[PDB]
Symmetry: D2
Subunit: 293 residues, 4 copies
């Protein structure tokens, strides 16, 4: 009965009237897996199913959310799921993966996502499991081009001055950016967000940072830079502070990357008009981070 | 109108990997992560209208009602004090602090009543307040009726406050009359509605150990009990078989719904509620 | 696949900020039969099915939109539909009914054929349709903030079902205002009369009208209803029928007595293209 | 933002009383009573952002695009001037005057914002509403906006896994490489190939006869209770032929561009 198909997406947008009424926040925690990544996960799996690539299941590297989404969709749809994830990601992710019956292989913190990718490739070779490859798979961008972006455009009454989003895989900003630039052209500003400690998109060196779910340490092959107008950095403590602030002031239980996005969106909105409309995303929820937030 | 717009309009999913006769309404989609967002909103909106909240809100709670109240209070500018038994999952305590509620851990009603006298803070009283029932009469029930294409054989729900079963039950009985079976669920270890004595149990969210004043028995046909272990087991099963990250009371409701479905035809349609999400119970599930 | 169940209801509300921003209008033409009547028709038919009343089909006497709704649902669900109708109602109605396969010609028919009369003025399921769909929709769509709900009475199902819900939530903090034609002011204590406000003003007090939830009755002239229907199309781009003009005209009178920030909700029962010959 | 919020997000119904392989998107639910509210909105919003509407709008009409533009112009405060063949239903004529229609041309056959409306609204809707499972999408071509925008999205998602089928009148089979001619399927068959038609996303063209379209529109009303117009009959007639070639379990989506009460005179 198409459970996951029907549940994933169509998430709400709220105006942050207690913080800055120019900021509009899309609440991706409403997805059944608790994050925005249910969308690319579903698209990638559906493509892989159609092409007959999953006889031996799935193995995928993850910072947590894409893995949770894959694990959930695999549990329902009948695919074995193996994930690799750095040991530095919140322990809540590990427990959720176990609950969903996925197999989790932790990789060295110091090797970051690169380490997770390498271990996934090794497991793929040993087991025959299929890597969807969230950093290279066009269906990641398509999920946002065909669901998230269309949603945003209409939910915002076709009036948007800026769209702001952290880059993990770059799927969100690429797919949404394509739609919004398609509609508005240079009437809309698309702003990528990354950690001050790992400013690779800005042309800097990778580094250790605490904003889980962004700042992969390299430039994803799927990132569509043609739709991005600029890159803004956010400090670890600014992201944490804003996530705490969202819960306290708006009653919105969002994760650390949501904090980062809203902190960035505030900087973007302050640089322009009092009637500016700046949209961003809250990728997931606060209870996936109680261990650290 | 942030909380007004966010709360309710939750999806229903058919549990095809467990039993395709069971349909589960996913109340974790609510902004506070549970079903209690609905009564918390209605009760607050009524208390605001009536000018009762100038000293804030104090409520004794199991957890979800407190989270809902704390969230709405955070956004709408009400001081929220909660008294909560220490036995409830610690996730609740961290969540309540993040939402800026003042918590006093502890039945615990004595402390809440004490606090009300000392501060003037207003007790919404989730067990007595008719707006708990109205929230389900005017949101949840109408949603379920339409979402199920006006075809329901049974509605099964755990009773905490009784709001959900009473408000949904009124709508369903109004439309179906005797053609729908309304089943209340309670813990085997505290089978008060069945006529037994109150007891300690682990099905968080249900089984208050008394009959709530708001419970509308006129809409309820039968009472079914569930064991603590059945509830936990079915909660884990929902995550592993359906990919559904639901809490303990969701396991209890679906365990009961299966029992109900098993007594009915092949094509019976049995609806129940998943009150909250699995990540609220990582410490125990 | 429950076609009619899924299509009926969940209609939008729009704020009339080119006419008066205090008025909020629920667009019932979005229903598959083009009117509010799809809701009571659905509820009454589902009840009758449950109770095994439809072996010989349906016969119902109507002004028009209820006939269209019943014809449509009968067509989809496989019930014979016989209708009886006054000639003074838009001809566009006769063509639509035949398109939907209704047999046009009630008590005698029902007696002779065994066809079942739904009895739109007496059937509690008319009210329930609004108590369980329309009312709940309005309450949430309006963010739980309503000063008044204004609606013309045909069968009285809309105002009764919505008013039950809004009174439940708001108590005396909401005003429920019935609208009727000045020319047939029966709810106001006057004598029935011929009038042009198609869809309201049946000339008697319907049995299902729940007068317990109604605070006041307002009248509208035939010319006011027509002028406002034309105004809605020209100023708002809203292609609504005559009873919609009546409802908005009344709602404006209600709003004008309230503050600048009042929120007054009303309904647009059907669409303008059902009245080309007369509007 | 009245028109922004009302336009789009229309339902799909499965035609179980005709053929349960056919899924119909009901565009009469739009406030102007047709699919053309979508391109009219997008083209008008683009023209406003570009400052092109100081002197209002003037445009060519088969019918529905005129109604949509007149409606949106009425609400948003733009003067609207239109032109139409007398062969189209007189219902349209009364509606336009109701909306106050009597300057910038939008150019419905050449304006990319027509295609964008379907690329960003209709296509995404269809993809989700069909649970990402579609074997064919079948649509008549008037401007070609619908098939081009929906086609782009569905080809992106399914590639050669989805068949995109254009529909035109047997009496004017121009997309098939034949000659134009007069026909009665209002809303399609313009008699030339629109500039915006994306031929890179279309797999085939199927023709429908005038009587086929009419019979099927009457069939939809009598069997499904769906009060749809002539071009909706054409679309479903075509989808039926497509589904019949595909077998038991095929999922074939099409569109019902407008409503039956716009054609009572025919």
């Amino acid at each position: 009965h198409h459970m996951m198909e029907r549940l994933i997406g169509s998430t709400p947008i709220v105006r942050l009237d207690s913080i800055d009424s120019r900021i509009f926040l899309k609440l991706e925690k409403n997805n059944p897996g608790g994050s925005v990544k249910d969308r690319p996960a579903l698209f990638m799996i559906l493509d892989a199913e159609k092409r007959g690539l999953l006889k031996n299941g799935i193995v995928e590297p993850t910072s947590g959310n894409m893995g949770i989404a894959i694990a959930m969709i695999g549990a329902k749809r009948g695919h074995r799921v193996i994930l690799t994830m750095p040991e530095t990601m919140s322990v809540e992710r590990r427990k959720v993966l176990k609950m969903l019956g996925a197999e989790l292989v932790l990789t060295p913190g110091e090797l970051g996502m690169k380490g997770a990718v390498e271990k996934a490739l090794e497991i793929s070779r040993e087991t025959g499991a299929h890597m969807l490859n969230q950093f290279e798979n066009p269906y990641n961008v398509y999920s946002h081009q065909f669901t998230t972006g269309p949603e945003i455009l209409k939910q915002m009454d076709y009036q948007i001055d800026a769209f702001v989003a952290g880059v993990g895989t770059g799927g969100t900003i690429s797919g949404v950016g394509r739609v919004l630039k398609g509609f508005f052209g240079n009437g809309v500003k698309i702003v990528a967000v990354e950690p001050a400690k790992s400013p690779v998109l800005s042309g800097g060196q990778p580094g250790k940072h605490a904003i889980q779910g962004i700042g992969a340490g390299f430039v994803p092959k799927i990132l569509d830079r043609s739709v991005i107008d600029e890159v803004i950095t956010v400090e670890d403590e600014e992201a944490y502070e804003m996530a705490r602030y969202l819960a306290k002031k708006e009653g919105l239980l969002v994760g650390i990357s949501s904090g980062a996005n809203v902190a960035a969106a505030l900087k973007v909105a302050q640089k322009l008009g009092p009637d500016a409309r700046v949209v961003t995303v809250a990728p997931d929820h606060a209870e996936r981070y109680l261990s650290i937030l």
